[PDB]
Ligand binder design. Structure first.
Ligand SMILES: CNC(=O)Nc1cc(OC)cc(NC(=O)NS(=O)(=O)c2cc(C)c(CCOC)s2)n1
Ligand SMILES: CNC(=O)Nc1cc(OC)cc(NC(=O)NS(=O)(=O)c2cc(C)c(CCOC)s2)n1
Ligand SMILES: CNC(=O)Nc1cc(OC)cc(NC(=O)NS(=O)(=O)c2cc(C)c(CCOC)s2)n1
Ligand SMILES: CNC(=O)Nc1cc(OC)cc(NC(=O)NS(=O)(=O)c2cc(C)c(CCOC)s2)n1
Lengths: 317, 319, 317, 318
């Protein structure tokens, strides 16, 4: 039978015997995501061009607003927002959400694939909600995923039950389940990183990419792909296998990607899909953050590829 | 004044004082591109998944372009990536134009939701002979129109003609391509290079040297960023929008590159050249290559004039 | 805050402390309505006309499948099916649904407004599901309403909490709650029936309609409207007050419209809006169905108007 | 083979060897109409209900006005929404005068009644400076007219010298697809359409005519009655199924209710091209010579046999 995100989430919820907040949260995110998709695909653009005589900002407003009205959240961290937003007590629910409302957007003018990234934490404590409630390691995630506004719009949702992929059908505004309990290839054949930073790379990354173009075991060299938009690169990685890297560079000594709402959700998705995600020194999900916008290196993808990077990392110490 | 594709085209058609054929042609193509975009974004996918109790997107895309063009009464010969031979339009539906197209470029990887696209180049039939495959064998120098539709975060049709390059955004609420970027030009020099670095061991020594100049500047300048969607239309469009260079060169294993001359390299070269950019195979202008096979491959380095220049300088250092 | 159908039903469910099966049912039918809306508006028609080289039935198929796959129904009665449809054991739920998938499609060739009507019963016996589970008075309805495919598409949902109207936003595929706990006017100024067949009218119908045209006192004669499509006629009556008649006469002593999936849902909606709905002889909701496709007369709308009708009806009885 | 309004229009223009001014206008109307549809079906209504934290007739008028101005094909625009004729600025002047109802039936849209956009297009006839007088042409002078019905689906019906063609809007691709070619109305229908709530006000001709529908003197089947109360809807049904549509004069509306310029003339034009009729009772709607842009006319229109029957009755009563 056809399954939808709405149906899927209510069924899982009923099995966990949960009260419904997470469902209401995920339903509201789904609303926000459909509306961001609408805007990204430029529906209504003629009206801007005068037929009857910002997108990152709107994206933030959509998610911020649908999350508040959900009655499920209490602390909301966005890449757009300097500090955590503390939800008003009347609208307060139990979950903390870290999101990137429109990832890839700084290059939206070339119509590059963009996406929304979210990671959901339950707030355990009896304290009044504070920004510090967002400072959890990714291991604590209850749900995470992303919507990709590529050629088509897909929501990938990860929870304990694994990874599940939902295609937006724009004809009916329905997220349709199209890839159940997804698992990433053990080993892939594409590597993904901005090689313009070659000059800046640590020797571990240098040697690893060197292996990719010039295989030690006489296998075929890996192909290379770097959209430059993380959701697009992480999705392809999930879909076709392989490895994605944003290692530290000169201008980014702790990486450029932000831990809470870029790294953690993609590391969670990956792990739930039987892939891996490391900073090199430890797993992304094990990093305990001290700043809500802290940056992290990230090497993620197919388990064999990632263990081969760390193999090399571990050689250089 | 809001401007759309149909309006722009019609006014150009009138400026030129044409009979209307190229306009019907582009009109048909515009409709095919709308239906492609619809299909690509997965409208109706719910039905494939059993909501009420099938052709692959590249096949559909080809069928939409083929049919619309035949029915525009503006074409006589059609070359499509999908068809080994050129399609000779039936006499009753015959017009003066030859269209070569790639109906859904980058679709081989569509499973990951990569940007994909439709590329076209339009020629006048120049023989008096009955129409044949040979009419499609013109250098891109002879192009009347060309461009692409990109189905990315949004859908955009980029159309290059004598008057220059113009970008139309698809508003899916109404199904109009609205004019959003007029008489586009490329930066003289960019800061991004774009090619599959994974096949580096197969690199031509000129290509190795240039990519080394980009990553490891010899003059204190800042290294270029790398970007490679692996989907031509996405990378070329980024090239057009942000500047820089796109490479699919010939190596040793592929003396003629990989990308197809007629319906891939030519239209993009034409778009680039119309926007004050450059496109070379290494040996000459893409648009100068006189083709001998409709499905023949070509190397292509394209983008900013300064960046391409530099590639050519390095290429000539290796001869 | 912005309210949607899914959110509204989930919060009603949680307030009722239900197990969520009605919510599942409703969300499933919602999905079917969005998809019927898409087909009614002719999305995809270009393909049928060969760009690249049934409606009532498609609507029926959409409703049935979404309902069966909800895990919420056991018996389904459609205008389109000769017999009740018994849901397969593995997907059986507690509810029985009566519906008219595409009401008034008889004339869809003129692009007249169309509609889907539904009424939802809880199954009352533990007996093996049969046609008998559907033979309940409309009084026993848990929920009922309609989807109007008009200038816009709206879902009107009646339950014990009252009547709430939701606007389908096609940009995102969300029913937006635009009218809350709606109530009908006390007295209307519109009468709605098929006057072409005046010669077959009951003496009482004749007199009543004469009174609307030629009022005894110094009042304005009512307007007339008759769409010929029940959902459209009943919605207008809802919004503008007044009276809609599809009455019994000598040749049709039980009327023409069907009790289970036309009259009962509409009478339930009317009653929850403070309206009225009689067969002339009794309230439509009080009629005990003996056959699933049985006919009933219906006079419904603003309470004064309906009571005025009964006065004339009683005059002639 | 698939034909679309844009394709159909161009081919008709090249066939008549026109310069393309009527095509630019008709393309501009087509766009505005898809824009009207999208608003009418309530795309984006969630933003007005505060998802991220104009009146439809007003916006509908603005989309026609701006699209027609920007066509460069028009000089005088008459709209239901505007008391005075709009005179197109000189730099954008073309040769056509367009009278339109940007959102007919809108005043009841609150109940999601079928609404529509109605239009008639005249060539500016006088050589005078563009003014309101340019809109005061008899319906017979129409060059093209029709409507866009926003019902269960959106349809544009376009009537010209080559006849009447109907195009379904496909919302997936924003394209008007030709679905009914060279449309003709049935010789005689079995439906009559009018607001009988004015029965007390009817002149005896209208009273008798309707009586004959209900209690047929040859004892044939009574006509059915339909009345949406939205002109486009009621007239589209009359074209599709045949029969008759009446909105006669009444005490509230002594010169009729429906507007001559942008309700009666466009629909009368469509009817005649489809081989039906349209009369005010005394004369053909298209023969009425207007004196005022918002002037009203009684109207009886539809299948020829049925209008011919109304007129024999009208003549029986003088
Ligand atoms: C007692 N409940 C009952 O009888 N019926 C009923 C109906 C219903 O919808 C109608 C929803 C729910 N509960 C619900 O949603 N709980 S939840 O905490 O939000 C949740 C969602 C997911 C998806 C989880 C999976 C957790 O994986 C990490 S946990 N219950
Ligand atoms: C005699 N024609 C006349 O009086 N009016 C009129 C109306 C009309 O639309 C109503 C269209 C046209 N002509 C037309 O379309 N010509 S065309 O060859 O197809 C063309 C398209 C483009 C875009 C060109 C520019 C090429 O730039 C290098 S040339 N003419
Ligand atoms: C115990 N439940 C719990 O802990 N969480 C939770 C979450 C939830 O959504 C997440 C939904 C629900 N329950 C629910 O839907 N029940 S229901 O029978 O389907 C229903 C729908 C309507 C609309 C009714 C009103 C009927 O009027 C009498 S009753 N429960
Ligand atoms: C000389 N023209 C030529 O060689 N090519 C060419 C191309 C073209 O578009 C590509 C349009 C046109 N002409 C055109 O549009 N004329 S028009 O006055 O606007 C018109 C529209 C309709 C529909 C009419 C029929 C009127 O019947 C009542 S007349 N011509």
């Amino acid at each position: 039978d056809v399954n939808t995100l709405t149906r899927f989430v209510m069924e899982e919820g009923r099995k966990a015997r949960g009260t419904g907040e997470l469902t209401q949260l995920l339903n509201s995110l789904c609303t926000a995501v459909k509306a961001i998709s609408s805007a990204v695909r430029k529906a209504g653009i003629a009206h801007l061009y005068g037929i009857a005589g910002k997108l990152d900002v709107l994206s933030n407003d959509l998610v911020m607003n649908m999350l508040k009205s959900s009655f499920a959240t209490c602390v909301l961290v966005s890449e757009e927002d300097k500090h955590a937003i503390i939800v008003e007590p009347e609208k307060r629910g139990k979950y903390v959400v870290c999101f990137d409302p429109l990832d890839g957007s700084s290059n939206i003018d070339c119509l590059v694939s963009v996406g929304t990234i979210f990671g959901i934490y339950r707030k355990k404590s009896t304290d009044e909600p504070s920004e510090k409630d967002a400072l959890q390691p990714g291991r604590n995630l209850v749900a995470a995923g992303y919507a990709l506004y590529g050629s088509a719009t897909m929501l990938v949702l990860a929870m304990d039950c694994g990874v599940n992929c939902f295609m937006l059908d724009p004809a009916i505004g329905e997220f349709i389940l199209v890839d159940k309990d997804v698992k990433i290839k053990k080993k892939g054949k594409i590597y993904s990183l901005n090689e313009g930073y070659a000059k800046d790379f640590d020797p571990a990354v240098t040697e690893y990419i060197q292996r990719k173009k010039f295989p030690p075991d006489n296998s075929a060299p890996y192909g290379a792909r770097y959209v430059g938009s993380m959701v697009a690169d992480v999705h392809r990685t999930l879909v076709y296998g392989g490895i994605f890297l944003y290692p530290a560079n000169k201008k980014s000594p702790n990486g450029k990607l932000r831990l809470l709402y870029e790294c953690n959700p993609m590391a969670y998705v990956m792990e739930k899909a039987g892939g891996m995600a490391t900073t090199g020194k430890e797993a992304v999900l094990d990093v305990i953050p001290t700043d809500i916008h802290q940056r992290a290196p990230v090497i993620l993808g197919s388990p064999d590829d990632v263990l081969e990077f760390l193999k090399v990392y571990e050689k250089h110490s």
